[PDB]
C-alpha cells in the first residue's frame, strides 16, 4: 500500500533516505493487533479511529482526554491518516490528568492494569504498550515497566525531552523495555531528545502531525512523539509475524537504518527505526 502526502515521520520510516513523502506499508496494517496508550486518554470519537480506539480504564472522575496528549500519541499509532498500523485496536489508559500529570502509584497501577486486562482482550497478532512519559529515576516505575513487558507487551518508552543522559529518567532508564529517541525529518537528533547507552532506537519527534481533542489536529514535538511511531511499528511487525512482544525491540534495532542520524553523541545508537517493507 501507499499513502501519498503522508506525515513526514510515516514515510521516513517506510524509507531508507529522508526527503520523501509517501508511506509504504503492507495492507495488514496491524490487524488483530493491540496497542495500549497510557497516557491523558483519548478522545475515541474521533473519525481517525474510526471505531477502533476505546478508552477501558482511568484513575480519576472522567475517562475523557482533556489535555489532547494521549489523542495525539494514539493517532501516531493507529489513525487512518496519521497511523503507522491503520487497523490496529486501540485501548486508552488514563494515568495522568487533564494537565499532563499524575502520580508514579498511578502509573504504576495503570501499568500493571494492561498486564492482566490484555488476557480480557482479543489480539491474537500481539499486544503493545506505547508509555510517552517518565520522570525522575525510580526502581519501581522501572519494574513495573520490567513486569508488564516480562507479561507478554511489547512496551515502547519515551527517552525523555531533556537533552540528558535517559540514564536518570524513569522508565527510560529500564533495560528491558524499548526506549526511544527523537530524530527531526533532516534526520537531525532532535535538540530536545535524550540520549545514552539505555536508548534503543530513534523514530520521527518534530514537528509531528497527528490528532488532537475537539476532533481537530495538530503538529508538536517530543519523544513523546517518536515513541508510538515505534510501537504502532511493533504491531505493524507482529502482525506480519515477523517478530514477538519479547523480541521486537531487538528486531527493530537489528532492521533499522543505521548511521544516517547527526547529532548522536558518542556511545549512543545511532538506529532509526524502518519498516523494511518493499512493495
Ligand atoms: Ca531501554
Ligand atoms: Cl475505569
Ligand atoms: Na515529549
Partial sequence: ??????????????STSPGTSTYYYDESAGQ???????????????????????????????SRDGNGHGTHCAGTVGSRTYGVAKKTQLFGVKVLDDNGSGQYSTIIAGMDFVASDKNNRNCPKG??????LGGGYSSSVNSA????????????????????????YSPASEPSVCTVGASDRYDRRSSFSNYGSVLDIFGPGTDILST?????TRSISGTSMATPHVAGLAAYLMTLGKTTAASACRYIADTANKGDLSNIPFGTVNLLAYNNYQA
Fill in 1 to 14: 500500500a501507499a499513502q501519498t502526502n503522508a506525515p513526514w515521520g510515516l514515510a521516513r520510516i517506510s
Fill in 32 to 62: 488483530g493487533s493491540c496497542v495500549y496508550v497510557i497516557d491523558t486518554g483519548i478522545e475515541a470519537s474521533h473519525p481517525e479511529f474510526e471505531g477502533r480506539a476505546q478508552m477501558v480504564k482511568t484513575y480519576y472522575y472522567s
Fill in 145 to 168: 515497566a520490567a513486569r508488564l513487558q516480562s507479561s507478554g507487551v511489547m512496551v515502547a518508552v519515551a527517552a525523555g525531552n531533556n537533552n540528558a543522559d535517559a540514564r536518570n
Fill in 212 to 216: 488532537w481533542i475537539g476532533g481537530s
Fill in 127 to 132: 499486544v503493545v504498550a506505547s508509555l510517552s
